[PDB]
């Protein structure tokens, strides 16, 4: 609704195609998008079903010089980028330029873990899929078809959450202090008639 220079999307609990469709529209709209925490993206359908959907992707390779053939990227960030790229006119210069405005990373690197991460309610699993419906995480689905960095990313995520929690405790301690001083001022209720 309002644009920023860059948007950092925390991609935990978002559906693959539901999020990739919104991102495809925002990129052509002319906005830089960073998708973080890709290895917790969700896809509808039970895990074995989607494992077959991706093992069929491994079957597509040119019979002459397979180095020419299709390249089946395994990282969760690369699978999400494949979804967006297929939802863009990448065979042009405006479609090509839309990819260059898209960043997809697994986990939250230090350049971005100190900024606010927004979510896309048009793609959130809790608001789209009926309860009891089977679904599979991209991070698990990559660690079973070749992606070999699942554990290290989980290891670094645990450390990052610890640091992020410590920051939040400090920020809450400061925030509760100013809130005490916020209510302490008398002018608060001589502006209360304005709703603030």
């Amino acid at each position: 609704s309002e644009f920023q220079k860059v948007v950092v999307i925390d991609a935990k609990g978002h559906l693959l195609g539901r999020l990739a469709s919104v991102v495809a529209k925002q990129l052509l709209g002319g906005q830089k998008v960073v998708v973080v925490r890709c290895e917790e993206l969700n896809i509808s359908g039970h895990f074995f079903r989607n494992k077959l959907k991706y093992l069929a992707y491994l079957r597509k390779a040119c019979r002459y010089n397979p180095s020419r053939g299709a390249f089946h990227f395994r990282a969760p960030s690369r699978i999400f980028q494949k979804a967006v790229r297929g939802m863009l006119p990448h065979k042009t210069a405006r479609g090509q330029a839309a990819l260059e405005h898209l960043q997809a990373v697994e986990g939250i690197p230090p350049p971005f873990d100190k900024q606010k991460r927004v979510v896309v309610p048009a793609a959130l699993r809790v608001l789209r899929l009926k309860p009891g419906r089977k679904y599979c995480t991209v991070g698990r689905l990559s660690s079973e078809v070749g992606w070999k960095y699942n554990d290290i990313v989980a290891k670094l995520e645990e450390r990052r959450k610890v640091k992020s929690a410590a920051f939040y405790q400090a920020k809450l301690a400061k925030q509760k202090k100013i809130a005490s001083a916020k209510e302490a001022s008398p002018v608060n209720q001589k502006l209360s008639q304005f709703g603030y």
Partner: protein, 168 residues
């Protein structure tokens, strides 16, 4: 939306029948013309009276006498199936007879992939005695202490900042 019409019709007076009998039926149509057309089709199929030989003497839209009293309706219909012959009876609970018919039509198009063409509504009846209610789902609705969590809460401004509560 549908509206309920009473249509009274008869064939043209003549020497053979100087005073033809009035034939009135209540039928549900979205508009005036559909009600007359459905009336002629019904009278032709049932009694064998030609469209040309007849004429409409009265058409009146009927409102719901108590559009705020929760009521239970039983609907007998003659579904035109793949064999063209099948009978049904479904129960509904709502406040307006047109509402029950409208809900029935959507129910037919869903559970039997039917048309407005294939459905022939025999009789819509108000059922008031609780023990005369047949269907299981409606009966369990009639218990006095009804209570249940809001089913399927499900709830431009893209890029919301905080994770939705999606709960209480």
């Amino acid at each position: 939306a549908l509206k309920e019409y009473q249509v009274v019709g008869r064939k043209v007076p003549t020497e053979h029948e100087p005073v033809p009998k009035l034939f009135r039926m209540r039928l549900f149509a979205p508009n005036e013309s559909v009600a007359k057309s459905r009336y002629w089709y019904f009278l032709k199929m049932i009694n064998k009276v030609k469209k040309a030989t007849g004429e409409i003497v009265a058409i009146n839209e009927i409102s719901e006498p108590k559009p705020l009293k929760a009521k239970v309706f039983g609907i007998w219909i003659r579904y035109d199936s793949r064999s063209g012959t099948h009978n049904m009876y479904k129960e509904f609970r709502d406040t307006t007879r047109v509402g029950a018919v409208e809900a029935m039509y959507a129910d037919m198009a869903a559970r039997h992939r039917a048309r407005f063409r294939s459905i022939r509504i025999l009789k819509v009846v108000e059922v008031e005695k609780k023990e005369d209610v047949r269907r299981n789902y409606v009966k369990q609705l009639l218990n006095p202490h009804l209570k249940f969590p809001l089913p399927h809460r499900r709830t431009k401004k893209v890029f919301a900042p905080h994770r939705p509560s999606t709960f209480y």
